[PDB]
Design a protein around this nucleic acid. Sequence first.
DNA 1: GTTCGATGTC
DNA 2: GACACGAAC
Length: 390
Amino acid sequence: VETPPEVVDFMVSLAEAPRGGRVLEPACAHGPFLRAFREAHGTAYRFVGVEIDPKALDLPPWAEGILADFLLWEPGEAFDLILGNPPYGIVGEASKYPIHVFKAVKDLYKKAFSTWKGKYNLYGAFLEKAVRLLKPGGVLVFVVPATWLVLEDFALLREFLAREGKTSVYYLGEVFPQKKVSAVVIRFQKSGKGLSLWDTQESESGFTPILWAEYPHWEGEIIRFETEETRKLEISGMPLGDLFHIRFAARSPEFKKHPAVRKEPGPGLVPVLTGRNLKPGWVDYEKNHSGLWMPKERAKELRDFYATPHLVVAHTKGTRVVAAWDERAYPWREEFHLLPKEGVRLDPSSLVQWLNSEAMQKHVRTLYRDFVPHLTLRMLERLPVRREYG
DNA sequence: GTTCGATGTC
DNA sequence: GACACGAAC
Ligand SMILES: NCCSC[C@H]1O[C@@H](n2cnc3c(N)ncnc32)[C@H](O)[C@@H]1O
């Protein structure tokens, strides 16, 4: 993975250090960011690049190279500027996750990083480590996925950044050819407070930032592209989450270990449904996408809520709200299952129609763009619906 | 109990 | 680019 020139040039344009300052590129390989910074600002800095793979470290004589795991590296002195493109990926078993480290090393990461949460990600660890390595007033400029703007795994990271300094986020989107990742640049300075959210446009010099919104009192809340229209709609209604318990489907292994589940159709069995069975306002009960079948009546053994008809909302159709009332109460292996709270009196068809509306699709696309390939729980619970009495 | 993807597929 | 599962906690 190489960082496109326009991205490097844009990041360097945001970068700042005092003359004689210490400039660091983590995960540097050949040090494209060190090289670009030097080209743009000249030679009067102390340049350092840290690389775990001795075969990849390839810095000119004017830079100090360090052969180490950046996440476990303890330099003698802090830095004025840290810039670069850290590795992205979840640490875990190779059959399922891309980053492979000895268990002892993962334990060491968890010990080191106060922001480490859930499965987490190398890029979040790199962000925390870099902030920790910054002098007061120091600056970090990274390109990372947009997922930390909204995901629960990054809640402690956002809160950490909010209390450690001031943050600017510049949305780039899908800028790495033949990678699906939607990217942002983060410029964090280890002083002051607040969040500024920026859009970008491609331009000759790389990208031109366009200030979108300012949040001077940011405390680590999810970051979204709000507009007059999204804000008004949220104020007009009430949160969907205040009317429904939101649960997720039982997972594939739960079905696999259930004594009534089969891998072939047969008398008295129905397909275990997935997201590919959910459509806007209807459910395809016929087509099997899971490879799994079971007696419909026994689905309640996996989750009690499978016993009765209820609203189902899609998780993996991108930044979209796709909803249906499952009138048959089938077993599901995927999707959100919404159960009305005490005293809520719902008209399902009316709600389904609203959730599936163009206005709702425009709403979520606006707020969340393409940061993640899902509608998440945090997004879903905030969807505006009619205010309900008491 | 539920989260996440430099996801993959075509 | 439309449309999408189990290891991890
Ligand atoms: N900066 C370009 C993308 S990140 C890929 C590079 O980071 C290096 N790398 C991966 N994990 C690292 C770590 N924990 N510490 C330092 N370098 C790392 C890889 O060897 C590779 O050269």
